[PDB]
Amino acid sequence: DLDNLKLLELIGRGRYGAVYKGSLDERPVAVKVFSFANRQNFINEKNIYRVPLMEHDNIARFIVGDERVTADGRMEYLLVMEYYPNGSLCKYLSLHTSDWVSSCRLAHSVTRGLAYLHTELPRGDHYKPAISHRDLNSRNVLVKNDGTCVISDFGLSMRLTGNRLVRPEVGTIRYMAPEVLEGAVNLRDCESALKQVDMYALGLIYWEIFMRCTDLFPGESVPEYQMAFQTEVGNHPTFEDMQVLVSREKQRPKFPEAWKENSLAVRSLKETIEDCWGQDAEARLTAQCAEERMAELMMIWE
Ligand SMILES: Nc1ncnc2c1ncn2[C@@H]1O[C@H](COP(=O)(O)OP(=O)(O)O)[C@@H](O)[C@H]1O
Ligand SMILES: Nc1ncnc2c1ncn2[C@@H]1O[C@H](COP(=O)(O)OP(=O)(O)O)[C@@H](O)[C@H]1O
Ligand SMILES: [Mg+2]
Ligand SMILES: [Mg+2]
Ligand SMILES: [Mg+2]
Ligand SMILES: [Mg+2]
Ligand SMILES: [Mg+2]
Ligand SMILES: [Mg+2]
Ligand SMILES: [Mg+2]
C-alpha cells in the first residue's frame, strides 16, 4: 500500500501534526505527520479512529496509519485520511457566508457528529464507548464538498464508558469552559463532566457559524469571520486572561444588535446557544438535545 504514498503541499498544522495533501495509489488523501515527540497523540488518534462503528457521515474518514524512518534518522508517524479540499470549518467560515438553511446545515451536521461521538453503543465485538473529544473547536472540524461538517483531530479524545478506563487543562485555551479554567471539573461523574466541556465549546462554534449567516444581517453586510472571543482577547490569549473573562467575569461572545429579537427564529437560536455555554455545566444541553433543537429550528422555518 504505502510504498506508493506521495506527499505534496502542506495544507495545515497544529500542536501535534503537520498535514499534507497527498497521493496514495494515484487517489488523493490527506496525510497527518507526527514527530516521535507526538507519538502518543498519533497512537491515541489512530485507536479512536479504529474503535468499532466510528465510520459515520459526520466523522472524518480514516484510511490507514503507518511508521517510517526518515532519511535524516528520525521516526515519523503518518495518519492517512480522506482529503477535504475546503479544510477546517474555521477556514471555511473565513471564506464563505451562508444563508439560514446552509448555516443550519453546518451547525446541525457538527452537532450530529458530536452526539454520535458522545453515545455509547453496547455491542460486544463492536462495542463503541462514549468518547469525549476534549479539544472541540472549528479548527478540529472539517467541511465536506457538500457543505456538511465532519469532526476530526482525536489526538486528545478519551473513552468514557466500558472497561479499562483511565481518569485524566490541555485543550485550546480560547475554547476552555469555565470549570476547566478553574481546574474544578467534576471528575467524580467523569463521563458527564467531559461531555459538558465539549458542549460548552460547541456553543462557541454555533456563535462562529451564525455570525457568518447572510440572513441574520438583513439590509447589511456580514462581518468578517472572527473566532470566538477574538475582539476581547486577541490572538493567543493566556490561560489567566481566559479565566478572568470567561469564568470570573462570566463573559461570552456577544450577539450583534442586528439580531433584533422580534424574529422568533433568532430569539430561539440565541437561547439554544446560551443553553450550551452556561456556567452551570450540569444544566447545559446534551449533544443529543442540541441536535434536536437545531433540527427543530430549521423546522421553525415555515
Ligand atoms: N483530512 C484533512 N483535509 C484537509 N485539511 C485537513 C485535514 N486534516 C487536517 N486538516 C487541516 O490541518 C489542520 C490541523 O490538523 P489537526 O489534525 O487538527 O492537527 P493537530 O492535532 O496538530 O491540531 C486542521 O485545522 C485543518 O486545517
Ligand atoms: N460488556 C461490557 N463491555 C464493556 N464494559 C463493560 C461491560 N460490562 C461491564 N463493563 C464495565 O467495565 C468496567 C470494568 O473495567 P475493568 O477493566 O474491569 O476495571 P477498571 O476500568 O477499573 O480498570 C465496569 O465498571 C463495568 O461497568
Ligand atoms: Mg493543535
Ligand atoms: Mg507522544
Ligand atoms: Mg483509546
Ligand atoms: Mg487540531
Ligand atoms: Mg472559553
Ligand atoms: Mg432531547
Ligand atoms: Mg437553525
Side-chain angles (χ1 to χ4, degrees), residues 13-17 32 135 137 139-140 153 156 170-172:
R13 67 185 324 144
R15 271 138 55 242
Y16 304 106
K32 178 169 184 180
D135 195 11
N137 61 60
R139 283 169 274 175
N140 291 335
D153 192 357
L156 298 164
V170 75
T172 300

Side-chain angles (χ1 to χ4, degrees), residues 154-166 168 170:
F154 301 100
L156 298 164
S157 312
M158 281 193 38
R159 305 155 107 107
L160 310 174
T161 56
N163 66 320
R164 316 158 72 193
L165 308 170
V166 300
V170 75

Side-chain angles (χ1 to χ4, degrees), residues 172-178 181 200 204 228-229 242 245-247 251-253:
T172 300
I173 297 181
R174 168 183 315 276
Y175 301 103
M176 294 182 171
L181 289 171
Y200 172 91
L204 303 175
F229 294 116
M242 290 312 292
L245 188 153
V246 169
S247 174
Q251 290 287 288
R252 301 291 188 279

Side-chain angles (χ1 to χ4, degrees), residues 67-71 73 75-122 124-128:
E67 344 184 348
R68 78 187 179 182
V69 183
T70 68
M75 285 294 298
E76 268 185 347
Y77 300 85
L78 312 183
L79 192 127
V80 181
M81 61 191 289
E82 179 169 329
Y83 169 56
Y84 299 91
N86 288 318
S88 73
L89 177 62
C90 180
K91 176 171 160 189
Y92 184 90
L93 290 175
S94 71
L95 294 174
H96 301 75
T97 65
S98 310
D99 104 313
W100 181 257
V101 175
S102 45
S103 298
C104 286
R105 176 178 177 84
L106 294 167
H108 177 272
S109 54
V110 57
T111 309
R112 187 163 172 259
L114 185 65
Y116 186 80
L117 190 73
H118 279 189
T119 299
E120 175 183 28
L121 298 180
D125 209 357
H126 286 66
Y127 175 77
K128 176 198 169 294

